[PDB]
C-alpha angles and dihedrals in degrees: 000000000000127000118289137291091043123158139227105336119029 
């Protein structure tokens, strides 16, 4: 998962 915020794929 990526750092927030992450859209759409995280």
